[PDB]
Design a protein around this ligand. Structure first.
Ligand code: CHL
Ligand code: CLA
Ligand code: CLA
Ligand code: CLA
Ligand code: CLA
Ligand code: CLA
Ligand code: CLA
Ligand SMILES: CCCCCCCCCCCCCCCCCC(=O)OC[C@H](CO[C@@H]1O[C@H](CO)[C@H](O)[C@H](O)[C@H]1O)OC(=O)CCCCCCCCCCCCCCCCC
Ligand SMILES: CCCCCCCCCCCCCCCC(=O)OC[C@H](COP(=O)(O)OC[C@@H](O)CO)OC(=O)CCCCCCCCCCCCCCC
Ligand SMILES: CC(/C=C/C=C(C)/C=C/[C@@]12O[C@]1(C)C[C@@H](O)CC2(C)C)=C\C=C\C=C(C)\C=C\C=C(C)\C=C\[C@@]12O[C@]1(C)C[C@@H](O)CC2(C)C
Lengths: 196, 152, 193, 41
């Protein structure tokens, strides 16, 4: 589709048949079709996790402007006490995610081989793409046209960049992400990465 | 106290070594006027020696019976900066260099006279290849998985 | 299948009892090695399926766990006990002599058989109640036997591993400890300190 | 000149330039951060 840099010719292996294809591959990671097949799924999963992470880091902090709830900032939520110890929660999360990710992994190797429920054999997911399961995972039956996939990928890339910014800003500033925006909005021409 | 060693900041021999070096440096200073340039150089050397000893004291090194720092390379988390991290950095840099060299060698293998491109470097091709080595681990791992790394 | 979406090895057709195509390392490619491995697996399953009843019943009756019963032999002159009653022949040199002689005869007798089918299911005098009359029931019986043996092997592995983490404690003591406060007495506090 | 650019791509000249830049960078790095024995970060 569009060009990430006008005046430069798109690589041949990027034929534009994929959603969100702008011909951006200066270092040639996706020359091998198997590598491209793996990296598409990797990007999809990374973005889908990153958007949720950013939503969970930003929104539970914007409460200060509204004063509705009281929750510690994203880097202090770990130290708080909970009804169960860290070890038990970590073990349960490991046990569940092992099964979930092993089930997801098998579809990349042999598509259409994990479409049937293992206990109740009369329940199955309708056939679809590798990274787009559908069925019960799409309860509202929104049509997955190419435009929506491009929107999803753009939002995922933006959220990856946002999470990287969130991580980097806290390391050097020592505060959360929302107050950094307010500090910049206070005096824009003096509060930047150049402190002076 | 691994293997009977002691911290640098608690070692008396370390302070004795620092005092001896400072005293040796200060002896030559008395031969020159305070405003003379050699006096400034000697003052800078003394300040650098003091700063080096203070920095060695701050980093939590271990001293032996002779007042000299010793390096632990067994993998203890308290001493991961002596061997582990610089080793990983060196491995990354060496892999970058090797991958760049291998890619350049492979690229020119199909030319009519490949031996001519080895003594007279094709600068644009090398420059286009140089930046590619920044992600060498991923490329190497995927090449190994696809069976391309080893010649048949 | 042991894992849906994974191809089966060519030598595991799924016709043998308790066959689910599990061989990631390919240890059974050789036809001669595979035949021996079935006998070894059956022997291990049969041996482990007798230890489990003998590892919980003595503990559940208050006679001590399974590792306390071996401590007396280290002491000099220790005498064995059974049901709280010492046995006259409980001396250490007498115990080993009967144990070695008794099992050195049965195992050597088992080794001498040459028909592969009898090395796993000999039949004959070891089946007095006649459960082998129906070939149709025999296959489901073999599947039941194979399925239970691996479970007992896993149970014995758990028994052995739990002892290392909690010395001097019995498996029933482990169950009682976990039952009281499930959300803090579990595997988690051991894996991470 | 094409022939002048060709002579700059010969192995000894390129090696000399690369190693000179490398040595300058290393000398400056050691000047900024002297007496380094452990990685503190
Ligand atoms: C991804 C991810 C990253 C980058 C971090 C990184 C962090 N965790 Mg965290 N965690 C992450 C997922 C998880 N953590 C935890 C459980 C904890 C705990 C109990 C603690 C942290 C703490 C921390 C902070 C230590 C510096 C830092 C913000 C510490 C902290 O918040 O100190 C300021 C802390 O005490 N994490 C769980 C549950 C198993 C996670 C999933
Ligand atoms: C992804 C993701 C992840 C990993 C988390 C993880 C967490 N959230 Mg959370 N959250 C998310 C998305 C996510 N959130 C989104 C999309 C919204 C909207 C929220 C709104 C939200 C609220 C309002 C609160 C949490 C809280 C918490 C913490 C304790 C709750 C718990 O796990 O039980 C935990 C670290 C709680 C917390 O940290 O305070 C106790 C809390 O009060 N979350
Ligand atoms: C804003 C980002 C975004 C966008 C545009 C989409 C868009 C889409 N997703 Mg999706 N997804 C996202 C984030 C997003 N997703 C995240 C964060 C997760 C992880 C929880 C998923 C998990 C997910 C699954 C598991 C599946 C989809 C599917 C789909 C497609 C059909 C469903 C649909 O139209 O939903 C539209 C969604 C919105 C308009 C979001 C509105 C905002 C709300 C708060 C569609 C292209 C399905 C698919 O492609 O197969 C049919 C499918 O099976 N998504
Ligand atoms: C869309 C992403 C995004 C957005 C909106 C912001 C926005 C902001 N960043 Mg920021 N940042 C980002 C990504 C982003 N960042 C990433 C990816 C990194 C990692 C390199 C950083 C590292 C960073 C630092 C170290 C600091 C900020 C700071 C700031 C604030 C002052 C503006 C400034 O100095 O710009 C800085 C801009 C950059 C460093 C370039 C980021 C790349 C651009 C945004 C690509 C997106 C187009 C402002 C709210 C400063 C702050 O705390 O505010 C007072 C500050 O000190 N950012
Ligand atoms: C086949 C494996 C096996 C082995 C090696 C043992 C070995 C042992 N059992 Mg035993 N046991 C087994 C199966 C086994 N048991 C089974 C299947 C049951 C259920 C009926 C029992 C029920 C049982 C009881 C009730 C007691 C023992 C006890 C003992 C110990 C000494 C006395 C004894 O029975 O000697 C082995 C001789 C014949 C099995 C000895 C370590 C005694 C003990 O705890 O000693 C301290 C004891 O009180 N066992
Ligand atoms: C006496 C004056 C003087 C001063 C103040 C400097 C200062 C500097 N030189 Mg330098 N240099 C000088 C004379 C001087 N040089 C002479 C006479 C030569 C021989 C012709 C060189 C050859 C030289 C080389 C070959 C290199 C430097 C580099 C550097 C920078 C090292 C810091 C760095 O890498 O950060 C990053 C750089 C900056 C923050 C600003 C530049 C620093 C700004 C290094 C450099 O710039 O690294 C990129 C470097 O590689 N210098
Ligand atoms: C494989 C052998 C080897 C290794 C691992 C090292 C390792 C090191 N040398 Mg080194 N060195 C070596 C051979 C080696 N050298 C040889 C053969 C010579 C003689 C040419 C030198 C001459 C030398 C000097 C002159 C200096 C170092 C310094 C250093 C330290 C570098 C500090 C920094 O920031 O960079 C580092 C521990 C620097 C340092 O501060 O050491 C503590 C320093 O100033 N080295
Ligand atoms: C030094 C500065 C370096 C960066 C310079 C960036 C110049 C502007 C171009 C990049 C931004 C852009 O195209 O935004 C618009 C793009 C693309 O946004 C949309 O993405 C869709 C994906 O399916 C389609 O490609 C759409 O055509 C496209 O408009 O935004 C992003 O890709 C977001 C993440 C990257 C943001 C910029 C990072 C740098
Ligand atoms: C997960 C990633 C791979 C991990 C395993 C890497 C090694 C390869 C697989 C070995 C798996 C395996 O069992 O390989 C067995 C293989 C062949 O052994 P044999 O030819 O003796 O027996 C073959 C029969 O078992 C086939 O049925 O190699 C060996 O001889 C043993 C090598 C290790 C010897 C260790 C002890 C040395 C003293
Ligand atoms: C998944 C992710 C973040 C996930 C976060 C999650 C789930 C949760 C976070 C939490 O906050 C919560 C919710 C609650 C808190 O209490 C705890 C934590 C745990 C803190 C980020 C991904 C982030 C992913 C990023 C940033 C990826 C960047 C990739 C780039 C830039 C690649 C560039 C190129 O590869 C191209 C495209 C083409 C090549 O040819 C050239 C180059 C240039 C190499």
């Amino acid at each position: 589709k569009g060009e990430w840099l006008p005046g430069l010719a798109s690589p041949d292996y990027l034929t534009g048949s994929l959603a969100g294809d702008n011909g951006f591959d200066p270092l040639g990671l996706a020359e091998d079709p198997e590598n491209l097949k793996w990296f598409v799924q990797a990007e999809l999963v990374n973005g889908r996790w990153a958007m949720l992470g950013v939503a969970g880091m930003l929104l539970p902090e914007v409460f200060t402007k509204i004063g509705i709830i009281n929750v510690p900032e994203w880097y202090d939520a770990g130290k708080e006490q909970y009804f169960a110890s860290s070890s038990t929660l970590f073990v349960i999360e490991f046990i569940l995610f092992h099964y979930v990710e092993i089930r997801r992994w098998q579809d990349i190797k042999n598509p259409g081989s994990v479409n049937q429920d293992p206990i109740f054999k009369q329940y199955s997911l309708p056939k679809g793409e590798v990274g787009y399961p559908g069925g019960i995972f799409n309860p509202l039956n929104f049509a997955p046209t190419q435009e929506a996939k491009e929107k999803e990928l753009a939002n995922g890339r933006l959220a990856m960049l946002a999470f990287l910014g969130f991580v980097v800003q806290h390391n050097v500033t020592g505060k959360g992400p929302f107050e950094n925006l307010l500090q910049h909005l206070s005096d824009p021409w003096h509060n930047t990465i150049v402190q002076t | 106290d691994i293997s009977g060693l002691t911290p640098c900041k608690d070692s008396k021999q370390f302070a004795k070594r620092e005092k001896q070096q400072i005293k040796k440096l200060e002896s030559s200073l008395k031969l020159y006027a305070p405003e003379s340039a050699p006096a400034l150089a000697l003052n800078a050397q003394i300040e650098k020696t003091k700063r080096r000893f203070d920095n060695y004291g701050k980093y939590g090194l271990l001293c032996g019976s002779d007042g000299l720092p010793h390096l632990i390379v067994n993998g203890d988390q308290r001493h991961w900066g002596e061997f582990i991290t610089p080793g990983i950095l060196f491995l990354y840099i060496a892999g970058w260099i090797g991958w760049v060299g291998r890619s350049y060698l492979i690229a020119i293998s199909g030319e009519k006279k490949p031996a001519m491109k080895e003594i007279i470097i094709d600068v644009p091709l090398a420059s286009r290849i140089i930046f590619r080595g920044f992600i060498w681990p991923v490329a190497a791992y995927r090449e190994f998985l696809n069976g391309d790394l080893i010649a048949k | 299948h042991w894992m849906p979406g994974e191809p089966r090895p060519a030598y595991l057709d799924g016709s043998a009892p308790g066959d689910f195509g599990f061989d990631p390392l390919g240890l059974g490619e050789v036809p001669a090695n595979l035949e021996r491995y079935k006998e070894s697996e059956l022997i291990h399953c049969r041996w482990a399926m007798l230890a489990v009843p003998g590892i919980l019943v003595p503990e559940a009756l208050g006679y001590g766990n399974w590792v306390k019963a071996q401590e007396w032999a280290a002491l000099p002159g220790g005498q064995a006990t059974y049901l709280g009653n010492p046995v006259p022949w409980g001396t250490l040199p007498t115990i080993l002599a009967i144990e070695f002689l008794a099992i050195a005869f049965v195992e050597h007798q088992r080794s001498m058989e040459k028909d592969p089918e009898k090395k796993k299911y000999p039949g004959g005098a070891f089946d007095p109640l006649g459960y082998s009359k129906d070939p149709k029931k025999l296959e489901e019986l073999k599947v039941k036997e194979i399925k239970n043996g691996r479970l007992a092997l896993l149970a014995f592995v758990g028994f052995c591993v739990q002892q290392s983490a909690y010395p001097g404690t019995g498996p029933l003591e482990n169950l009682a400890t976990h039952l009281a406060d499930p959300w803090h007495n579990n595997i988690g506090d051991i894996v991470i300190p | 000149m094409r022939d002048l650019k060709t002579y700059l791509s010969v192995a000894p000249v390129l090696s000399t330039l690369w190693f000179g830049s490398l040595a300058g960078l290393l000398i400056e790095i050691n000047r900024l951060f002297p007496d380094a024995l452990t990685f503190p970060f």
